[PDB]
Amino acid sequence: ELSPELLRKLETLAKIRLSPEEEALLLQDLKRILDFVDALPRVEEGGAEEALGRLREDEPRPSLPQAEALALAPEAEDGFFRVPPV
């Protein structure tokens, strides 16, 4: 139950550009996989557990030096991360 259109839609949502060769390939894989998974039985689910999470105190923690941060950037300009324009 997987049309070439859905693949296109999916690859769109995931922002992944695959070659027409891979499309035909992945089209077969995804089919088999989605069939395997669909075999999963449905089951009832109980109360959504107790909430035992914690919160962080509003206390400042030293930041990265601008130099170290921009060193990861493929492109930087005057202390900014530089990307192609919108």
Partner: protein
């Protein structure tokens, strides 16, 4: 052998610098063929090895999986997207080992982003099994395992999401522990399924696992999902039940290879002569867990790997457009990654969320339940880590056929239950592993129960080609 080294070091018989030079040489001579390490801790090793006090882990050096952040060292996650990425921070686990005298030897080879079961999906190169150069070391922590079995390192860190630590450990005949979800920090782990990921220790002896865990585990203020539970591992100074109840899982008994069935029967005889009440139990929906996993994990993976566009740190694919760059950069993913994140997007996509994700969530809650009920009647659970030993390259490259490798190990993660793979014998020349798991928080149980076995047996640990 790890604790043996630290012993020689503390008595002045050897210096940390000596141990490093020894291991560094061995790597430079054996790794070329093995392909276990991607990166190596450069001059910063020799330099760092000659400024250490006789600390708990002084003389020790660790091989870390390359999806675990190490400040100043190339952390690629086995991907092209990050083949030049070097973290400005350090993973909490790694940070702690460092503060106890430990040092990083290098970074270990893995399947791209941890999604793989054979290392055949590393963007760089495959890793070879020291026991058979014609067979895989498992995955995705294939590198770490391979490194241990060849004594390229005393200690090793891996990553487990569906058995990515146990399956390799089995294939390479070493110990691999998946920590109860929350024991070890996830901060610094380039993880792919947040709800299932855990850094796991691996070593050639159980006493060594204790060393790692005792150092690595513990509450981290940076990880909101970490448990406030003091390690206390090295208290494997046994006052061990005698008489624990052990439950064997029926569902995992059929479909195993001769060597696995054989190794299984023998193990039972051993646990019985140890004072354990061995009984067969039922893990009703265990066999259907593999499916739930390959819909829950891919889901979280799509959202976790979404950040990898060329904007701030990855590789830039050089599109020259706006979206066209993001679209081209992500095209640098491997076939397996693409496959999973496409699945993940579908399962969460509109019209399919409740029909799939919501479905698998409810099922994940069943397993936890069925497990709670099982540990009301038994204290430990036993099953194979895998139905067979390491397979040969090329053998099992079918989407589904690869997924079934993690058949027996998937359950540990969906539940959060601690699980340990231990060398339980052989079938020919290839090692065989058995999986022993306990209730939440009782990780130390697993360890001592395996110390009993490691001892009751002289050793089922063969060192393919190892030496100091």
């Amino acid at each position: 052998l790890a604790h043996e080294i630290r012993a020689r070091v503390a008595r002045g018989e050897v210096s940390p610098l000596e141990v490093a030079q020894a291991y560094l040489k061995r790597v430079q001579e054996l790794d070329p063929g093995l392909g276990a390490f991607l990166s190596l801790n450069e001059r910063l090793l020799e330099e760092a090895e000659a400024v250490d006090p006789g600390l708990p882990l002084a003389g020790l050096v660790v091989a870390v999986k390359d999806n675990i952040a190490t400040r100043g060292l190339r952390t690629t996650a086995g991907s092209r997207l990050l083949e030049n990425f070097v973290p400005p921070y350090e993973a909490t686990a790694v940070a702690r080992l460092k503060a106890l005298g430990a040092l990083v030897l290098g970074k270990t080879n893995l399947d791209e982003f941890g999604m793989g079961s054979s290392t055949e999906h590393s963007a760089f190169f495959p890793t070879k099994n020291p026991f058979d150069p014609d067979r895989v070391p498992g995955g995705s922590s294939g590198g770490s395992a391979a490194a241990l079995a060849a004594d390229l390192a005393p200690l090793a860190l891996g990553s487990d999401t569906g058995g990515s630590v146990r399956q390799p450990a089995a294939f390479c005949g070493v110990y691999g522990l998946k920590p109860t979800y929350g024991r070890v920090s996830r901060f610094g782990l380039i993880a792919y399924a947040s709800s299932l990921d855990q850094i796991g220790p691996m070593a050639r002896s159980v006493r060594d696992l204790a060393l790692l865990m005792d150092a690595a585990a513990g509450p981290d203020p940076l990880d909101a999902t970490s448990l406030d539970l003091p390690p206390r591992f090295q208290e494997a100074l046994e006052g061990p039940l005698p008489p624990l109840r052990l439950g064997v899982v029926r569902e995992a008994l059929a479909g195993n290879s001769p060597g696995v069935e054989r190794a299984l029967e023998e193990a039972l005889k051993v646990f019985r002569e140890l004072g354990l009440s061995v009984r067969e139990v039922s893990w009703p929906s265990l066999p259907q867990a593999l499916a739930a996993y390959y819909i829950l994990a891919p889901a979280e993976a799509s959202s976790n790997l979404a950040r990898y566009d060329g904007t701030l740190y990855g590789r830039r694919a050089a599109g020259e457009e706006v979206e066209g760059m993001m679209e081209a950069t992500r095209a640098l993913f491997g076939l397996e990654v693409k496959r999973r994140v496409l699945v993940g997007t579908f399962v969460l996509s509109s019209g399919y969320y409740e029909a799939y994700y919501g479905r698998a969530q409810a099922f994940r809650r069943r397993l936890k339940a069925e497990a709670q009920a099982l540990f009301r009647e038994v204290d430990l659970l036993l099953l194979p880590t895998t139905p067979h030993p390491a397979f040969p390259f090329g053998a099992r490259r079918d989407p589904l056929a690869m997924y079934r490798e993690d058949l027996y190990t998937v359950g540990a993660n969906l539940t959060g239950l601690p699980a340990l793979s231990f060398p339980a014998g052989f079938e020919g020349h290839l090692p065989v592993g058995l999986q022993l798991l306990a209730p939440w928080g009782e990780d130390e149980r697993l360890l001592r129960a395996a110390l009993a076995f490691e001892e009751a047996t002289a050793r089922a640990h063969l060192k393919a080609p190892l030496g100091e």
